[PDB]
Ligand binder design. Structure first.
Ligand SMILES: [Mg+2]
Ligand SMILES: [Zn+2]
Lengths: 609, 1320
RNA sequence: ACACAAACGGCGCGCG
DNA sequence: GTCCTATCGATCTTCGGAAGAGATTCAGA
DNA sequence: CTGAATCTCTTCCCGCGCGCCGTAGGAC
């Protein structure tokens, strides 16, 4: 028993063990923190570094002996804090949430000291950690030796880990609040205070807004300068005049050089910000990106507060058609039931026709509800009135992509809609009521079936998925990239998934980052467009799709002829580095974890020319 | 409308519309009734200890024709009261004592008594009395026993889908589950043969039992199969056709009669064809003889002409067999009517499988299976078989079990024997066959009707009976062995086994819960909780989604929302507000009757099986005040399905909209608007709430606040109609109206408030007064508030001033922003109490003692102690400070010190000792002090008692022995001295003096008894013979990381404290208390919270305008008009008040209470609508939108456009950061494995989880990992050397080798395996 | 003599 | 009361679940 | 030596917080 199973030595002790110089704390968000920084409480810090403190004290010579040093620390005297600051001056530290999803689940930080007891985390990072501040705890560990410190700083440090390893894509995309404030800022108003002036540049734009003589999203003409990096990368400037809203100009000041102004000259939802930041990094590199992220984070909070982006019950405008469509639909359903009483239709046909009537009714409600809210703003511009996208709180939150979805608003403003038993059978009458007006008892009771089912599935799924991952990690762990080339000229061929008729994925995304197995045949015949083992990075992939390619042959890890391992060229690009992998890396765990995290999100319960 | 004095101080404004008839039933009814029913010595034979005994007794021995027979029991009063028992830290047990008759009947004669003796009240029992609040007091503990949901005793019918042996077949299952004893199961084999198995033992053919039940094959066939017949009628064996049996058939030959053909080969048969066939007398038809051969014979047959028997029932026919029986002279051959689907051959199928033939073989065979590899014996087999299902002592169906069973078989008679019988088995068997033949329907185990609730009383009794069974073995042997002429019953029965059984049951059973005393609501919801776990139930992992998911029958019976998070989901459930339990233990709910056209106030309770028959309208459905539904048709659930039905076409209506939810959900206002997910969270968080020091009340209420507080029992109640005269914040005493003053009674009632005392969750429960001397009270009025209560209104948290908006990211995510004002305002300051105790041991190197002469410890700590070595009450201490100066020889400071990292104040000393132990000065004074306190209460009680006794003397002194000039100056005991004969005055003086002495004696003996109890020591555990208990009080403010929750599932942690200047503030110069993240609202879909804040904001405004007038000297007329207009506002609300009547004095008193803010009620599903809210805002001082502009406290500039500003009720959860934050740099290590200790209680280190190692592995870092396990976890040598190097500033590690690895190697090597390390 | 300190294994309830 | 001493293993409130592959196992072929 | 219908010892997210609680039989 002591050996076998979950309680066995292997799991109990060997593959996981309690460690000194560790602590756990409750989490909090520190907006002031820079991305590389983390805030921790003095109390924990004082404990954690006692051996370090003693050394400095005896290096100071203030403590005659270890016991004396320990004795002084009990005082918590000012000098202790002075030494503690010196000790902690740059020492990296490790923070991990539990259970970890992936290697991003653990990252290194530089500490700052706090009077309270919670541990403070940068908001942008926590999202990657999947932290929700409803009470989440977190564990801290300190690397002791020189080698670990460099290891922690070189790899784990947050600045290194902007890219997801499951996909070479930024995991840092801003928060709900940060994105919304910018979204509100980047929106435009047809007419506004101070509208219609000409500004030399952002400098006066900020001043004019700060003085309140012009509104943030008021329309304005501006002069601006922007930089292009030449064929080699040398950045040269151009100046031009633009028509824009004021908020865009001020935000441009935060934008570093080398990025076209057009990307920001538009309303910026999470969609736009996601690709803007992603492209920015590739064009400019990492170092500007990390600092660029912080300024984005600071700005978003500041003007989100100024916006006063509150939400109120009055904001939830209800379409009058809701009653009309409901009454209209109800009449038709009654006809279907009567026709069944007439014998004109079977019960199943009677049933399914009714739900179709409801489906049309609900959608028409969605049409009316959604169309009204977005349309809800009529404004005067130098006389006469015009329509523009509504500044409604609810619409902005969903439209910005910060939170929710069209379904949520449809329930709240429209109807909770059709609903089903635990068996999945749809109740032959939907939940016609919205939430702005209360449910009826039975309607609410019906909803309980769905809600609990969702919780039930989650509970067992989370347990089942973990046991799956354990199986994955064990088998995968053995594989390691050790060779540069295995020698094969063979490979597999890649295509876009062609199902449900035409494609449902682009071949561009899949071939990216791989290596050819044979030279690419150029459009036409006998001409070769790419070498036989070219690292298929972005431009060539763009070049290929520019051509009439349908499929291409690439080397694969499975085809890799390596002994006791894998060859780098077969693996190609590293998701977390962009460039080809460094030799000596155990990919197997990475792949296992990559699959493991998303698995939790699953569930356990002629057409054209 | 009129109100009580307690009600007439905060008349909570209401908006509910429905004038519900039925009041909220008493909450704890289930528990109290359960135990009361169990504990009573009910003369009737059902339920309670009496029933258990009658089940067991009489108990007899074959040996001497001797028995001991049962007589009823006596129950003794408890040794100590609740608090004395609690203080002493023991179980609040009562003793059981019984009478029984022990007899010896005569041998060789009619069994008259040689000797019989009735027991001298043998005692063996200690059972915990259900405390007043329905809890049970255990040793130093208070516990709650939850109610268990278990599969009811009855017969079940089930089918499998897809699991049917992969064949795509349908498999049918039938099970009989007794109330007690062996399981019995019947099953349809994939090969369609019917098999039986006992207690999940190996498969057997059902027919074996039939033989065991002494039935022949022909009898078996007659029971199960209808006959089909052929007869020699002028030619070969014409068939006795019954045309109806041709249903769905196609003829294979000519079917003809009366010169008319009705069917021919290949032609189908139908009903109209059948009508002609029988109508035309087709009773005989010569089927082609080969068709006869296809059938199977229904009987065994003889060749009577030769006295020979050659034919077997179940034998399939052949043409020669037709000749053989005809050769035997038989006029008829009988065969078993069958159809390929309508009438299956399953019994015949089984008969072919069955190897057994006779009852001997059946009895032998079954015994063999029950007794594998054991000697059979015919009578042994029979007796064993009898035990299986035909003796209560091994198989028993309770009254409910039999009733349930009879209901299943569609018996109109529900009564029956507790044991089974042949017919009962046959009926069940046939039903399963009926289902197989497509003429039966399966049950739904999840349907409530199949499920019943067990309560404390029921479970305890069964546990009690089990103990008797273990007595049975002992007593029987003793009785068999005993001489019986000098042995007496106390010898025959010994307590130990029985006491243990109940004793261990309470302390160990999963259903026994260490009560979540967190807060008043936590207890009550915890007490009415339903669990599926435990014996006879499922297990937290073995539960399919279907069982977990809410079932339609749950409506109005089990709250669908309350189920707690985690694996408990769907397993743990709470009763509805109006829930009730049937005598059978079925959860039942009341409904109103649709009497013809009018719904009527008559109410009837139904179980789900009853509800299926009728149609029931929604509670909120409109009606015309006569009973007729305003709409001619209404929405109703008939068989759980939702459909609309006409007035007088519907049958019943639900009494109350709140009927669907439990109390925990009920407290959430505007629930109808909010999504279930958040709602569920809110309910659980309620019990998570911790009281606050400055607790006042909820503003936006639901209407449960008064009821919950009263039924909780934490508040004091007026037991009699009375007026108040005393206050000390420790006791309250009431003078009672004459109509409730009893003829030989004082006429006064006194109560003692419970003060600061650690809860089960380390929180104080001190009660507070809410009254004044001379103040009147009705019976049942609220006398004293308890934790989280005011005026008997449940008050968990605080009404905060809040707005929704982003604020510099500090409120991103659930993060909650907080103002320094709130902490200064004490809103969420809270008090915690911790207990620390020390024991003195019989250490073999010399026993321990408490002393101030601690070795080498500093003077300052010693100063904190007294000369007894004990810290003083009221002291203030910090981590490491000495509390108990206990020491060990060889002397040593084996003393108790404050835990590291905590500071608190000291209030308690309780000292205990074994018998034969000397006391100290501290204990003596405390013990004497408590004695004095009891005496003081007794004296004051005596003072009124004698005062009433004096009143009798003084009254007659008005007319006889008149001495009013010096009335009481002649002492009131000297009043007797009058030199009088039997005269009226003397008779009063002389007789009442005897009563005066008895009264004096009662206090004396009560006084003596009290101090004697207080004086005595305790039966401490061995190895220690004196104990001291110390309590420590901690006051806690709010810090970043504390967990905060709003009722609408909006939980979040707070992280900031701001200079009050920074907070956004309104044009009226008022800052907000809190700021919340707005983006959560659409994500959570709990808009109701916003409705709360809007309403609360309006409620505050009403109070403010009231406050301004009261702050001014506005005359009462203004106050009268303003308040009355406030209450009358709204739609057709149910509530009303008549302020004009209240003397203009209670108006001020009532009005003063209002100036804090208007308290409002909001029925769960009949709350106020927006239009009403808009009017209130207009009646207030705010726009109908409720949103306001605000200004940045940092810059003084206005925020863009209005924002939501409102007043919300907010709760503090018992999870504040300091109680969870933990850190360790260095510390001890475990012996069995050198890895660090674990957890917070011990100074353990964090566990580096297995998965997290993988994450580390994902990165290329290796040195970190090496250091992680070697240095930091599992290498004594390395970590010590590392320790020095750090002092040396090298920060370098030596590789080492994990010690635990050696442990594994040893263990493996300790196996039969040889394992080694290889150098090369 | 310049030095150790109080957990082994279960159960229930909650937590993200 | 304290303290010594020898096994420990039957009949009672038991059943409360279930996917997946190596024996052993049902029906002849 | 073919066949299913029979057959039983593996496994059941990672961590955390209290509370309780552990051989039988006997000199009387
Ligand atoms: Mg969380
Ligand atoms: Zn390769």
């Amino acid at each position: 028993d002591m050996i076998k199973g979950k309680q066995g030595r292997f799991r109990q002790n060997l593959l996981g063990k309690r460690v000194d110089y560790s602590g756990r704390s409750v989490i909090t968000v520190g907006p002031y923190l820079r991305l590389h920084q983390c805030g921790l409480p003095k109390k924990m810090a004082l404990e954690l570094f006692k051996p370090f403190i003693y050394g400095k004290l005896e290096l100071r010579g203030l403590a005659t002996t270890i016991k004396a040093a320990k004795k002084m620390v009990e005082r918590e005297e000012a000098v202790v804090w002075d030494i503690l600051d010196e000790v902690i001056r740059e020492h990296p530290v490790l923070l991990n949430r539990a259970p970890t999803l992936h290697r991003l689940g653990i990252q290194a930080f530089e500490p700052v000291l706090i009077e309270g007891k919670a541990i403070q985390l940068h908001p942008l990072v926590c999202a990657a950690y999947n932290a929700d501040f409803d009470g989440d705890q977190m564990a801290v560990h300190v690397p002791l030796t020189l080698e670990a410190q460099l290891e922690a700083r070189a790899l784990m440090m947050s600045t290194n880990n902007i890219l997801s390893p499951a996909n070479g894509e930024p995991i840092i995309v801003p928060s709900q609040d940060v994105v919304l404030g910018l979204y509100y800022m980047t929106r435009d108003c047809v007419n506004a205070k101070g509208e219609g002036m000409v500004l030399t540049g952002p400098k006066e734009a900020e001043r004019l807004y700060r003085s309140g003589l012009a509104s943030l999203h008021a329309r304005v003409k501006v002069r601006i300068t922007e930089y292009e990096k030449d064929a080699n990368g040398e950045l040269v400037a151009k100046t031009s005049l633009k028509d824009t809203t004021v908020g865009r100009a001020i935000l441009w000041m935060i934008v570093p050089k080398g990025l076209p102004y057009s990307i920001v000259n538009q309303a910026l939802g999470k969609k736009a910000i996601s690709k803007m930041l992603n492209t920015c990094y590739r064009i400019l590199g990492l170092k500007p990106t990390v600092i660029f992220a912080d300024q984005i984070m600071y700005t978003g909070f500041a003007y989100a507060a100024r916006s006063g982006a509150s939400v109120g019950i009055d904001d939830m405008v209800i379409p009058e058609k809701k009653h009309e469509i409901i009454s209209e639909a109800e009449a038709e359903v009654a006809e279907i039931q009567e026709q069944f009483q007439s014998g004109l239709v079977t019960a199943g046909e009677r049933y399914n026709k009714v739900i179709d009537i409801w489906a049309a009714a609900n959608d028409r409600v969605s049409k009316a509800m959604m169309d009204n809210l977005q349309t809800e703003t009529v404004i005067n511009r130098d006389g006469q009135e015009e329509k523009q996208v509504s500044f409604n709180s609810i619409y902005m939150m969903a439209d910005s992509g910060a939170r929710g979805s069209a379904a949520q608003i449809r329930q709240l403003a429209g109807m909770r809609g059709l609903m089903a038993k635990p068996d999945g059978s749809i109740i032959e009458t939907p939940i016609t009521a919205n939430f702005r007006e209360g449910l009826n008892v039975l309607q609410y009771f019906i909803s309980t079936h769905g809600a609990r089912k969702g919780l039930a599935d989650t509970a067992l799924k989370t347990a089942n998925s973990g046991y799956l991952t354990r199986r994955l990690v064990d088998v995968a762990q053995d594989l390691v990239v050790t060779e540069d080339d295995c020698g094969t000229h063979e490979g597999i061929m890649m295509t876009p998934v062609i199902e449900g008729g035409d494609v449902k994925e682009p071949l561009r995304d899949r071939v990216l980052g791989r290596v050819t197995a044979e030279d690419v045949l150029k459009p036409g015949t006998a001409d070769i467009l790419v070498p036989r083992n070219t690292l298929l990075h972005e431009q060539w992939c763009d070049l290929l799709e520019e051509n009439s390619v349908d499929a291409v042959k690439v080397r694969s890890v499975v085809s890799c002829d390596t002994d006791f391992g894998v060859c780098a060229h077969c693996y190609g690009r590293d998701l977390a580095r962009g460039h080809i992998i460094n030799k000596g890396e155990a990919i197997g765990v990475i792949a296992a974890q990559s699959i493991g995290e998303p698995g939790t999100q699953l569930t356990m319960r002629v057409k054209n020319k | 409308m009129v109100y009580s004095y307690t009600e007439k101080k905060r008349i909570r404004k209401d908006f509910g519309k429905r004038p519900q008839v039925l009041d909220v039933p008493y909450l704890l009814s289930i528990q109290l009734d359960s135990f009361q029913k169990f504990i009573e010595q009910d003369p009737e034979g059902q339920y309670g200890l009496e029933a258990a005994f009658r089940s067991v007794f009489p108990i007899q021995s074959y040996s001497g024709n001797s028995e001991l027979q049962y007589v009823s029991y006596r129950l003794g009063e408890p040794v100590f009261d609740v608090q004395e028992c609690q203080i002493r830290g023991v179980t609040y047990s009562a003793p059981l004592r019984v009478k029984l008759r022990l007899v010896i009947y005569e041998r060789e004669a009619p069994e008259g008594t040689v000797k019989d003796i009735k027991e001298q009240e043998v005692y063996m029992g200690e059972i915990p009395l259900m405390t007043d609040n329905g809890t049970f007091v255990i040793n130093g503990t208070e516990r709650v026993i939850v109610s268990q949901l278990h599969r009811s005793p009855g017969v079940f019918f089930d089918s499998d889908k897809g699991k049917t042996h992969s064949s795509g077949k349908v498999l049918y299952n039938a099970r009989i589950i007794p109330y007690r004893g062996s399981w019995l199961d019947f099953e349809f084999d994939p090969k369609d043969n019917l098999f039986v198995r006992i207690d999940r033992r190996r498969k057997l053919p059902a027919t074996i039992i039939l033989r065991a039940l002494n039935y022949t094959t022909e009898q078996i066939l007659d029971l199960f199969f209808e006959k089909v017949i052929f007869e020699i009628r002028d030619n070969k064996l014409q068939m006795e056709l019954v045309p109806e049996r041709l249903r769905g058939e196609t003829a294979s030959f000519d079917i003809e009669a009366n010169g008319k053909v009705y069917v021919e080969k290949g032609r189908r048969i139908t009903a109209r064809h059948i009508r002609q066939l029988e109508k035309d007398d087709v009773k005989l038809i010569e089927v082609p003889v080969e068709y006869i051969a296809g059938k199977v014979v229904a009987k065994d047959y003889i060749d009577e002409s030769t006295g020979e028997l050659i034919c077997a029932a179940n034998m399939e026919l052949s043409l020669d067999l037709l000749a053989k029986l005809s050769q035997s002279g038989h006029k008829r051959i009988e065969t078993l009517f069958t159809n390929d689907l309508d009438h299956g051959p399953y019994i015949s199928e089984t008969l072919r499988v069955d190897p057994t033939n006779d009852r001997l073989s059946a009895l032998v065979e079954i015994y063999r299976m029950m007794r594998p590899g054991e000697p059979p014996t015919r009578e042994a087999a029979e007796s064993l078989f009898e035990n299986l299902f035909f003796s209560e002592d091994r198989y028993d169906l309770s009254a409910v079990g039999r009733m349930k069973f009879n209901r299943s078989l569609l018996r109109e008679e529900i009564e029956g024997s507790g044991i089974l019988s042949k017919d009962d088995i046959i009926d069940v068997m046939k039903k399963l066959i009926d289902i197989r033949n497509g003429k039966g329907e399966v049950d739904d185990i999840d349907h409530l009707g199949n499920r019943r609730i067990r309560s404390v009383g029921e479970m305890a009794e069964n546990q009690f009976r089990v103990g008797l069974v273990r007595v049975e073995r002992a007593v029987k042997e003793r009785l068999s062995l005993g001489d019986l002429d000098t042995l007496m019953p106390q010898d025959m029965i010994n307590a130990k086994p029985i006491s243990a059984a109940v004793k261990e049951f309470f302390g160990s059973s999963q259903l026994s819960q260490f009560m979540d005393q967190n807060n008043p609501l936590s207890e009550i919801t915890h007490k009415r909780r339903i669990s599926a776990l435990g014996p006879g139930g499922l297990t937290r992992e073995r539960a399919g989604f279907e069982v977990r998911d809410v079932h339609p029958t749950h409506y109005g019976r089990v709250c669908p929302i309350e189920t707690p998070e985690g694996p408990n989901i769907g397993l743990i459930n709470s009763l509805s507000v109006y829930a009730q339990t049937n005598e059978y233990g079925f959860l039942e709910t009341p409904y109103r009757k649709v009497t013809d056209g009018v719904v009527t106030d008559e109410i009837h309770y139904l179980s789900a099986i009853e509800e299926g028959n009728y149609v029931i309208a929604q509670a909120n459905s409109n009606l015309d005040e006569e009973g007729h539904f305003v709409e001619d048709l209404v929405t109703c659930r008939s068989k759980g399905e939702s459909s609309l039905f006409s007035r007088d076409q519907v049958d019943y209506m639900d009494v109350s909209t709140q009927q669907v939810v439990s109390v925990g959900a009920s407290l959430i206002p505007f629930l109808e608007h909010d999504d279930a997910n958040r709602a569920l969270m809110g309910a659980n968080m309620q019990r998570q709430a911790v009281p606050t020091l400055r607790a006042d009340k909820p503003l936006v209420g639901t209407g449960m606040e008064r009821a919950v507080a009263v039924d909780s029992g934490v508040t004091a109640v007026a037991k009699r109609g009375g007026v108040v005269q005393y206050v000390d914040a420790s006791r309250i005493v009431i003078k009672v109206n004459e109509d409730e003053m009893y003829p030989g009674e004082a006429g006064i009632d006194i109560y003692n408030l419970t003060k600061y005392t650690r809860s089960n969750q380390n929180t104080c429960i001190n009660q507070m007064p809410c009254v004044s001397l001379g103040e009147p009270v009705e019976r049942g009025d609220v006398l004293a508030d308890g934790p989280s209560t005011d005026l008997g209104e449940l008050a968990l948290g605080q009404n905060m001033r809040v707005a929704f908006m982003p604020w510099n990211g500090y409120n991103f995510e659930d993060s909650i922003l907080v103002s320094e004002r709130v902490v200064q305002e004490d809103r969420f300051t809270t008090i915690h109490i911790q207990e620390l105790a020390c024991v003195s041991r019989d250490t073999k190197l010399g026993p321990e003692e408490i002393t101030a002469d601690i070795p080498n410890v500093g003077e300052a700590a010693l100063s904190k102690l007294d000369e007894s070595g004990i810290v003083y009450i009221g002291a203030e201490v910090t981590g490491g400070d000495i509390l108990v100066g206990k020491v060990t020889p060889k002397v040593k400071d084996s003393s108790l010190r404050v835990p590291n990292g905590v500071s608190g104040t000291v209030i308690d000393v309780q000292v205990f000792t074994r018998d034969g132990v000397e006391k100290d000065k501290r204990a003596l004074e405390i013990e004497e002090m408590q004695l004095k306190q009891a005496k003081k209460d007794l004296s004051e009680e005596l003072q009124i008692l004698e005062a009433g006794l004096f009143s009798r003397i003084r009254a007659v002194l008005v007319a006889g022995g008149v001495e009013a000039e010096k009335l009481d100056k002649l002492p009131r005991d000297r009043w007797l001295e009058l030199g009088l004969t039997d005269e009226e005055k003397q008779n009063q003086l002389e007789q009442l003096a005897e009563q005066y002495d008895e009264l004096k004696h009662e206090f004396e003996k009560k006084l003596e008894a009290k101090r004697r109890k207080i004086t005595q020591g305790d039966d401490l555990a061995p190895g220690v013979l004196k104990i001291v208990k110390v309590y420590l009080a901690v006051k806690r403010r709010i810090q970043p990381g504390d967990k905060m929750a709003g009722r609408h599932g909006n939980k979040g942690v707070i992280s900031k404290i701001n200079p009050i200047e920074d907070m956004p503030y309104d044009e009226n110069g008022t800052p907000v208390d809190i700021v919340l993240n707005p983006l959560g609202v659409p994500s959570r879909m709990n808009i109701g919270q916003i409705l709360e804040t809007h309403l609360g904001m309006a409620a505050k405004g009403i109070g403010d305008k009231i406050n301004a007038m009261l702050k001014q000297q506005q005359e009462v007329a203004k106050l009268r008009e303003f308040i009355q207009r406030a209450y009358d506002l709204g739609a057709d609300v149910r509530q009303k008040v008549d302020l004009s009547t209240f003397s203009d004095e209670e108006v001020m008193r009532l009005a003063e209470n209002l100036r804090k803010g208007m308290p409002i009620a909001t029925p769960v599903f009949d709350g106020a609508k927006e239009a009403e809210i808009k009017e209130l805002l207009k009646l207030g001082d705010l726009p109908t939108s409720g949103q306001i502009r605000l200004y940045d406290g940092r810059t003084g500039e206005q925020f863009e456009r209005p924002v939501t500003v409102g007043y919300m009720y907010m709760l503090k959860l018992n999870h504040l950061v300091d109680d969870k934050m933990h850190a360790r740099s260095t510390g001890s290590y475990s012996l069995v494995t050198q890895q660090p200790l674990g957890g917070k209680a011990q100074f353990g280190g964090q566990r580096f989880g297995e998965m997290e190692v993988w994450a580390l592995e994902a990165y290329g870092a290796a040195y970190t990992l090496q250091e992680m396990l070697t240095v930091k976890s599992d290498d004594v040598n390395g970590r010590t050397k590392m320790y020095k190097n750090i002092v040396d500033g090298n920060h370098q590690m030596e590789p080492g080798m994990p010690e635990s690895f050696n442990v594994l190697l040893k263990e493996i090597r300790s196996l039969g395996i040889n394992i080694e390390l290889e150098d090369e």
